[PDB]
Amino acid sequence: SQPVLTQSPSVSAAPRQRVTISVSGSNSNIGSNTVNWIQQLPGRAPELLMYDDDLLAPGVSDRFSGSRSGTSASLTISGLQSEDEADYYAATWDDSLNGWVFGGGTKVTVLSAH
To answer: How far is CA 26 from CA 8, 38, 61, 72, 92, in A?
Structure first.
């Protein structure tokens, strides 16, 4: 009974680098409905990060940006910081199911030299 939206896989990346997370859906969801991005920090509850495709929730760093076109969307993290290490989830409405649908989550791991 898997998540309906398809996100790109979990990724590791170095501090200060950029990462792009992709999600695809279909006409019934992302095709005609805006996307929210949810961030779940380690040991914390999920929180809203971006909403209505490209808007920053209160308190969210301007290093995040979002986009949507056709049946896909993306979240871009610029100047990656260790505090960005988290699970990221796409969410949207689906008119054929008459309910909210979600991606499976993308973990962003931030590299450390130890």
So the answer is: 15, 20, 29, 8, 11
